[PDB]
Amino acid sequence: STVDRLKKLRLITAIKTPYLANGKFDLPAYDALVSHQIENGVEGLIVGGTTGEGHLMSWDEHVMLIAHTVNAFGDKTAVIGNTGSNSTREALHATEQGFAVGMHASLQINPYYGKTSKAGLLNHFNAVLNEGPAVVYNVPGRTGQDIPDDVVMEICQHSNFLGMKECTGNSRIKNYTSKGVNCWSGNDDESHDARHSNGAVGVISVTSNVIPGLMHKLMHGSPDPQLNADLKELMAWMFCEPNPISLNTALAMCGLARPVFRLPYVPLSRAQREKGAVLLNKVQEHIPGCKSVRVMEDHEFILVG
Amino acid sequence: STVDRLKKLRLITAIKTPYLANGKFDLPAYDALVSHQIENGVEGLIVGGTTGEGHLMSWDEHVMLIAHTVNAFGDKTAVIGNTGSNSTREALHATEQGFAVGMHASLQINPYYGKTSKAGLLNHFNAVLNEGPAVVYNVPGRTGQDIPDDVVMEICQHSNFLGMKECTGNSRIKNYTSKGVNCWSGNDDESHDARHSNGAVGVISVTSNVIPGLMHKLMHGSPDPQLNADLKELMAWMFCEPNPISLNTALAMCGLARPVFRLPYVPLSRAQREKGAVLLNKVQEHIPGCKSVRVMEDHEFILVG
Amino acid sequence: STVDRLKKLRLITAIKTPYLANGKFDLPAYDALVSHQIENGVEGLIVGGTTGEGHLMSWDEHVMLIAHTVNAFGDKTAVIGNTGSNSTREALHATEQGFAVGMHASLQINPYYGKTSKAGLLNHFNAVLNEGPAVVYNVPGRTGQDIPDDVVMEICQHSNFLGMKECTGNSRIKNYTSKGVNCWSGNDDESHDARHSNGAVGVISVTSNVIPGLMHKLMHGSPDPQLNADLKELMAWMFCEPNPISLNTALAMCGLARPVFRLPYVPLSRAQREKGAVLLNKVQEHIPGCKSVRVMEDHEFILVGR
Amino acid sequence: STVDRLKKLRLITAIKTPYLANGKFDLPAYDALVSHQIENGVEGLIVGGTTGEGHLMSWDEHVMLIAHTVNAFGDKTAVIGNTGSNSTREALHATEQGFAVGMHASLQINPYYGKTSKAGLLNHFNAVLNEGPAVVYNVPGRTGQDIPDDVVMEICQHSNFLGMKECTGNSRIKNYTSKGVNCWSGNDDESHDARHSNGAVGVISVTSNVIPGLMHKLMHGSPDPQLNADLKELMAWMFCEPNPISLNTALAMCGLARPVFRLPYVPLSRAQREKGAVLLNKVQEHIPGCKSVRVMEDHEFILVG
Ligand SMILES: *[C@@H](CCC(=O)O)C(=O)O
Ligand SMILES: *[C@@H](CCC(=O)O)C(=O)O
Ligand SMILES: *[C@@H](CCC(=O)O)C(=O)O
Ligand SMILES: *[C@H](CCC(=O)O)C(=O)O
């Protein structure tokens, strides 16, 4: 029942984690961002995902953020803690504590960097799936390892399997969905076509942080190729440096988060922010709480490490 | 002086981290392994590198292992703590403490998984290089990101830059070494030619864990293409699943570590162990402390997670 | 407003932290215990207090337990995280995170073991009081240091000061309450008289874990000195070894927690459990969810810590 | 043999842990202090004891400090890590890692604050004694619990039992030593008589941090009641606020550590420092490396917390 409901969510935001000047979490900024997400049709949140810089958190601040999100918003949105890890003990510890504070599901990446065998992946994934509902996250461009079809076709039969957050493209998604494997696209620039032509239930999105109502439009009803085309340049700019560099820069430019980065992330250059401001200005009415888009000066940004 | 001496080491072992039945470190097995390495010409150790499963350790056990290695062996071998991370604060914290316990240098990977921009890499690497001597570790097959030449040509001018642990091949190494950038090969199957034909000072090795004296032979004196050819099948078998799966299985088969795996690593299959036993038997006299090679049964292996 | 409401709570339970066989938290047992507390009139919980073995937890499991308690029960009971420490940085880190997950207040002991000066105490307490509402916890029999009156009379003026959890007796409480300092008694065997004759708002209780409805009766309405007298033997048995040894043994005996101890705590002896079973049987109808009281055998107990 | 040697040490210093302005460890100041201790006849160190503010450290910095002390000084002095705790698992974890980095012994307090039964104490102490040589530390004025004689008479038979660090007085010590239980006095103002009239092997000292050569004189050869009398006022001043408040203030006043306190410790008042300067000036030639003795102004002190 909880499984069945979560499987049908079409718009999940991998929520940005905003920071105070000293690098600690800015919960007022986080809460304002989440409220705007929910008012614009976002049905769930990945807390401390790649976009949310989960890998730059200590576990105690991450479980705090998950707990806080459940307590403030868990009746209004699905709360999916990114509690996966390349260490099985670390994944199990974090995932168990995440469910203990009331998160609805986990996001579970395959072991990045410390790559394992097929047998290792089945052990790791079965163990985390036993803890509660899980989205399985495939992103070989980051992890160094593609989760193979054979693994997915086995673990998809687990009663806590929600689906894939698939980043290897719409052909991969089409093959999975044609065999009854539920998929979210992890790539904003592919998500419209994933949803409308390849059987994806929807998207786990970066760009929704900025324009949640427009990503909602892209995921519901008839294909909207005009909106998809109108968002193309913005979506490319969101990944001109690795995510979440553009997102972090964009939210600062829109007055929605402080210009504070945890290293090793640093902001986009002045020239890239100039290009970005034009793209953000075109959709400013759909950036909730945005009063104006500023290019910003290099000295405004604070690096914490 | 310390920098100049470390730059000349030809055989460094990325030492395996052996485990007790309960998953904690087996320091008697570790110490026996290290002593065998030293008696066979190994000049340095990476402590808790990829091969040593540093990513599966908590920091307190990792700093303990580094400290233990310095105190027991630091007058007999170079001790290089793998204190890098995809989190800049984590890298700085670990690297500082590692130097405070007397390690001679660090190994510093680029941020894996949470990939950053060129500006981010320069910030991250300059910060860790300021802590003390560092080997810079490029392995895009694991990290999802190649450290580009432009970055290396900038950071190689740092006074604490020891060189690259380069895994993208002998052509990469030849270009770097021809421009005065010191390189160790990170690939055993390429290391002989890296050393003898491409200017590499030597190797940071996995296979040295098993046959340290033979890896020593490959790094010193005349080219030895016969030995290199004789070790080809063994070297391929060492990577038939991702490292350190074969290594961990091999050491158990040879009676040199307990058959205990921290998840997500699991042993090679029975069939793969059969193939391996034949290859290990061919070099048994060069496996220090090995009394016999056993194929082993599946039930003998213990998984901790 | 939040301060004013919290100051009036009369029955707070220093909730026991139950364990699985492997020593990790048993949240099903914890949640069953808490629900029974709330149905019997308990108005607040100290999470990971002395009784809850907060000092045997890692911070991540402690913040998890606080967060879990807020999310499952925070609309039905006050959640007071025991986030104090003898390390000021540790106290500030834990207390801040505790409030960030929605706890209503903290419990703040003076630095035990690593005892400091009067100036040190004022610095430490002002710092933790700035984080949010706090109960200040004085128990020199455990800490090695009595928080002196002059310190209390200074820090009681902080707008986040809720009161003392005072363990040095009813005379101490009477002096504080006569000068406008809100107090809860930390001693069950003194709590009835603290409440009814010495101006204490009520009790932060151990025995409420076992008989919450009876402790509720002792704290509300008219004096009930007969009930207080009737509970005297049980209350003494609850402290025949240092708390929470008897509590942990009792909840196992009553089938309300597994017989699992984190070291350095170990169960009461067989002979002490025999005496206890008789006392627990007398009040079994007031032990919520208790199906029977067993003496238990020594081999049933599991010690975790190695 | 190691046990027998350690049992005979007469002067052990509970070494102060000096801090940088930002509150992190000042290892240059620490190393200068330790070298001066060793040159003045100090035979061992308690690292991160009560006096060393072990309870204000994270375990990773504490094991670092132990490891550093072993590596720099372990051939010249006994290194005793204060790895005890009121949590048995925490004590075992820290004590094991401490021995793994080469410390010679542990200091093991009874569980403070979270007081346990007699059966609990025997379990706790047997467990930590099994890890390696241990001094057992009784200080009920801090812990809230006196370790009773029946516990001591049982655990004193353990082959790793070194003796008591006893703080309940010379009568307690005399009774223990008359029954074959080796004792160090934990109270500087009692230590001369403990040593010369009550069978104590010697002292685990605070005041030795300041005047190590004078504490050495009090522990060796004939009674020196004149020196003992001459040090009476200084010894009382060292405890006019709880240790290590006076020590921390004194070392700053003598230019031997920075005026930096980790909370909840704060310096002595101006008036107490005035009294102290007079007492320190009287023994200045016996304060190794001592600059002028300065009273100091209140604004010079830095509180970190
Ligand atoms: C998913 C976003 C996809 C990406 O940047 O690769 C997430 O968890 O942030
Ligand atoms: C280097 C080993 C090379 C590899 O497997 O990619 C190391 O640190 O283990
Ligand atoms: C022992 C010193 C005695 C004390 O102040 O109680 C120590 O470890 O510092
Ligand atoms: C309060 C109970 C008082 C005691 O046993 O000393 C608590 O936090 O457990």
CB distance A139 to ligand 1 below 6 Å? yes
Q: Determine whether the interchain pair D141/C144 forms a contact, defined as Cβ–Cβ distance below 8 Å.
A: yes
For A4, the token pair is 């069945």
Is residue A192 within 8 Å of residue A10, measured between CB atoms?
no
Cα gap B11→B5, rounded to integer Å: 13
Is residue D46 within 8 Å of residue D12, measured between CB atoms?
yes
Amino acid (one-letter) located at B287: I
Distance from CA of A265 to the nearest CA of B (A): 6
Resolution of this deposited model, Å? 2.0
A176 carries an active-site annotation: no
Give the chain A residue whose CA is nearest to the CA of C71.
A71
Cα gap A220→A236, rounded to integer Å: 22
Cα gap C103→C45, rounded to integer Å: 10
Work out the end-to-end distance of chain B between its first and last CA atoms, rounded to an integer number of angstroms.
Answer: 43
**Which of B12, B50, B247 has most ligand 2 atoms within 8 Å of its beta carbon, as the pocket-test mutant?**
B50
Q: Tell me which H or E stretch contains A221.
A: none
Instruction: Give burial (CB, 10 Å; 0-12/13-18/19+) of A291.
Output: exposed
For C285, the token pair is 């109808």
Q: Which of C13, A53, C142 is nearest to B115 (CA)?
A: A53
Rounded to the nearest 10°, the torsion over CA D216, D222, D225, D231 is -10
Q: Which of A47, A22, A34 is nearest to A258 (CA)?
A: A22
The number of beta carbons lying within 10 Å of the beta carbon of residue B73 is: 17
Q: Which of B30, B124, B115, B118 is nearest to B79 (CA)?
A: B30
SS (H, E, C) A24-54: CECHHHHHHHHHHHHHCCCCEEEECCCCCCH
Beta bridge partners, B163, equal B135
Q: Tell me which H or E stretch contains B11.
A: strand B11-14
Cα gap A258→A254, rounded to integer Å: 10
CB distance D110 to ligand 3 below 6 Å? no
The number of beta carbons lying within 10 Å of the beta carbon of residue B199 is: 19
Q: Which of B196, B141, B198 is nearest to B168 (CA)?
A: B141
Q: Which residues contact D121 (CB under 8 A, 6 or more apart)?
A: C264, D110, D111, D147, D151
Q: Determine whether the interchain pair D265/C55 forms a contact, defined as Cβ–Cβ distance below 8 Å.
A: no
Q: Which of B261, B267, B207, B262 is nearest to B231 (CA)?
A: B207
Cα gap D48→A100, rounded to integer Å: 36
Is residue D17 within 8 Å of residue D52, measured between CB atoms?
yes
Using DSSP, state whether B172 is helix, strand or coil: helix
Rounded to 10°, the helix D88-100/D118-129 angle is 20
The number of beta carbons lying within 10 Å of the beta carbon of residue A122 is: 17
Beta bridge partners, C262, equal C304
Cα gap D271→D222, rounded to integer Å: 37
For B33, the token pair is 């392994």
Q: Tell me which H or E stretch contains D53.
A: none
For D47, the token pair is 């690292």
Using DSSP, state whether C113 is helix, strand or coil: coil
Is residue B260 within 8 Å of residue B27, measured between CB atoms?
no
Is residue D30 within 8 Å of residue D18, measured between CB atoms?
yes
Q: Which of D183, A8, C218, A120 is nearest to B305 (CA)?
A: A120
Q: Which of C132, C130, C133, C204 is nearest to C166 (CA)?
A: C204
Q: Which of B142, B91, B162 is nearest to B120 (CA)?
A: B91
The number of beta carbons lying within 10 Å of the beta carbon of residue C179 is: 12
Q: Which of D229, D239, D235, D237 is nearest to D273 (CA)?
A: D237
Q: Which of D127, D103, D11, D119 is nearest to D54 (CA)?
A: D103
Spacing of C-alpha D265 from chain mean position: 17
B8 carries an active-site annotation: no
CB distance D185 to ligand 3 below 6 Å? no
Residue nearest to atom 5 of ligand 1 (CA): A243
Using DSSP, state whether A264 is helix, strand or coil: coil
Give the chain C residue whose CA is nearest to the CA of A27.
C100
Residue with tokens 């409401």: C5
Q: Tell me which H or E stretch contains D250.
A: helix D245-253
Is residue C163 within 8 Å of residue C136, measured between CB atoms?
yes
Cα gap D272→D279, rounded to integer Å: 11
| C-alpha distances in Å from residue A233, one per residue of A188, A207, C211, D253, D280 | 12, 12, 66, 65, 73
Residues in C closer than 8 angstroms to A104, CB to CB, are none
- Method by which this entry was solved: X-ray
Spacing of C-alpha C67 from chain mean position: 18
Q: Of all atoms in ligand 2, which is nearest to the CA of residue B49?
A: 8
Residues in A closer than 8 angstroms to C25, CB to CB, are 100
List chains touching B (3+ CB pairs under 8 A).
Answer: A, D
| C-alpha distances in Å from residue C209, one per residue of C12, C302, D8 | 10, 21, 51
Using DSSP, state whether C305 is helix, strand or coil: coil
Spacing of C-alpha B89 from chain mean position: 23
Using DSSP, state whether C117 is helix, strand or coil: coil
Cα gap A85→A77, rounded to integer Å: 24
Q: Determine whether the interchain pair A101/C27 forms a contact, defined as Cβ–Cβ distance below 8 Å.
A: no
Reported as half-sphere exposure (CB side, CA atoms, 13 A), residue D71 has a value of 28
CA dihedral for B186, B190, B192, B196, sign (positive or negative):
negative
Report the residue from D112, D245, D303 with minimal CB separation from C117: D245
Report the residue from C113, C242, C264 with minimal CB separation from D123: C264
DSSP B156: T
The number of beta carbons lying within 10 Å of the beta carbon of residue A22 is: 9
Is residue C135 within 8 Å of residue C45, measured between CB atoms?
no
For D150, the token pair is 């029946």
The number of beta carbons lying within 10 Å of the beta carbon of residue A159 is: 8
Spacing of C-alpha B204 from chain mean position: 5
Q: Of all atoms in ligand 1, which is nearest to the CA of residue A165?
A: 1
Beta bridge partners, C164, equal C136, C183
Q: Tell me which H or E stretch contains C250.
A: helix C245-253
For D141, the token pair is 């004025």
Q: Which residues of A242-257 are buried (b: 16+ CB within 10 A; e: fewer)?
A: bbbbbbbbbbbbbebb
From ligand 2's centre to the CA of B13, what distance in Å?
10
Q: Of all atoms in ligand 2, which is nearest to the CA of residue B206?
A: 2
DSSP string, A117-162: -HHHHHHHHHHHHTTS-EEEEE-HHHHS----HHHHHHHTTSTTEE
Domains of chain C, residue spans: 1-306
Rounded to the nearest 10°, the torsion over CA B203, B205, B208, B213 is 0
For C37, the token pair is 């507390």
Report the CATH fold assignment for C1-306: TIM Barrel (3.20.20)
Q: Which of A103, C181, A222, A270 is nearest to B119 (CA)?
A: A270
Q: Which of C86, B25, C204, C168 is nearest to D86 (CA)?
A: C86
Amino acid (one-letter) located at D74: G
Q: Which of B211, B247, B203, B218 is nearest to B51 (CA)?
A: B247
CA C186, C38, C18 angle in degrees (round to 5)? 70
CB distance B139 to ligand 2 below 6 Å? yes
Cα gap A229→A192, rounded to integer Å: 10
Ramachandran region, residue C163 (left: φ > 0; alpha: ψ -120 to 50; beta: rest): left
Tell me chain A's radius of gyration from C-alpha atoms.
Answer: 18
Reported as half-sphere exposure (CB side, CA atoms, 13 A), residue B147 has a value of 30
Q: A244 preceded by cis ω (within 30°)?
A: yes
Measured in residues, chain B has a length of 305
Q: D264 preceded by cis ω (within 30°)?
A: yes
Cα gap D244→A202, rounded to integer Å: 62
Measured in residues, chain C has a length of 306
Cα gap C210→C281, rounded to integer Å: 12
Enumerate the H helices of chain C as residue ranges: 2-7, 27-39, 59-73, 88-100, 118-129, 140-143, 149-155, 170-178, 188-197, 212-219, 225-230, 232-237, 245-253, 270-282
The number of beta carbons lying within 10 Å of the beta carbon of residue B285 is: 10
Residues in C closer than 8 angstroms to D266, CB to CB, are 116-117, 119-120, 123
Q: Tell me which H or E stretch contains D44.
A: strand D44-47
Q: Tell me which H or E stretch contains C220.
A: none
Is residue D61 within 8 Å of residue D25, measured between CB atoms?
yes
Is residue B53 within 8 Å of residue B265, measured between CB atoms?
yes
DSSP string, D104-131: SEEEEE---SS---HHHHHHHHHHHHTT
Q: Determine whether the interchain pair B68/D102 forms a contact, defined as Cβ–Cβ distance below 8 Å.
A: yes
Enumerate the H helices of chain A as residue ranges: 2-7, 27-39, 59-73, 88-100, 118-129, 140-143, 149-155, 170-178, 188-197, 212-219, 225-230, 232-237, 245-253, 270-282
Reported as half-sphere exposure (CB side, CA atoms, 13 A), residue D265 has a value of 29
Ramachandran region, residue B180 (left: φ > 0; alpha: ψ -120 to 50; beta: rest): left
Cα gap B285→C219, rounded to integer Å: 80
Q: Which residues contact B198 (CB under 8 A, 6 or more apart)?
A: B170, B171, B173, B174, B177
Amino acid (one-letter) located at A182: N
Work out the end-to-end distance of chain C between its first and last CA atoms, rounded to an integer number of angstroms.
Answer: 47
Ramachandran region, residue C223 (left: φ > 0; alpha: ψ -120 to 50; beta: rest): beta
Q: Catalogue the E-assigned strands of D71-225.
A: 78-82, 105-109, 134-138, 161-166, 183-185, 202-205
Q: Which of A198, A249, A256, A207 is nearest to A230 (CA)?
A: A207
Which are the residues after which chain A is interrupted (C to N > 2.5 Å)? none
Using DSSP, state whether D302 is helix, strand or coil: strand
Residues in A closer than 8 angstroms to C74, CB to CB, are 71
Residues in C closer than 8 angstroms to D56, CB to CB, are 86-87, 89, 114
Cα gap A207→A239, rounded to integer Å: 10
Q: Which of C246, C248, C255 is nearest to C294 (CA)?
A: C255
Spacing of C-alpha A294 from chain mean position: 25
Cα gap C183→C204, rounded to integer Å: 10
| C-alpha distances in Å from residue B26, one per residue of A262, B21, B244 | 36, 9, 17
From ligand 4's centre to the CA of D119, what distance in Å?
21
CA A94, A100, A101 angle in degrees (round to 5)? 95
Rounded to 10°, the helix D59-73/D88-100 angle is 30
Is residue C89 within 8 Å of residue C114, measured between CB atoms?
no
Q: Which residues contact D206 (CB under 8 A, 6 or more apart)?
A: D14, D51, D188, D238, D239, D243, D244, D247
Cα gap B72→B66, rounded to integer Å: 10
Measured in residues, chain A has a length of 305
Is residue B25 within 8 Å of residue B19, measured between CB atoms?
yes
CATH number, domain D1-305: 3.20.20.70
Cα gap D210→D288, rounded to integer Å: 8
Spacing of C-alpha C76 from chain mean position: 18
CB distance A49 to ligand 1 below 6 Å? yes
Q: Which residues contact A266 (CB under 8 A, 6 or more apart)?
A: A245, A301, A303, B116, B117, B119, B120, B123
Is residue C7 within 8 Å of residue C106, measured between CB atoms?
no
Q: Which residues of A30-55 are buried (b: 16+ CB within 10 A; e: fewer)?
A: bebbbbbbbebbbbbbbbbbbbbbbb
Amino acid (one-letter) located at A141: G
CA A48, A54, A59 angle in degrees (round to 5)? 100
Cα gap A15→C67, rounded to integer Å: 20
From ligand 2's centre to the CA of B14, what distance in Å?
7
DSSP B19: B
Tell me chain D's radius of gyration from C-alpha atoms.
Answer: 18
Cα gap A304→B12, rounded to integer Å: 34
Beta bridge partners, A304, equal A262
Enumerate the H helices of chain B as residue ranges: 2-7, 27-39, 59-73, 88-100, 118-129, 140-143, 149-155, 170-178, 188-197, 212-219, 225-230, 232-237, 245-253, 270-282
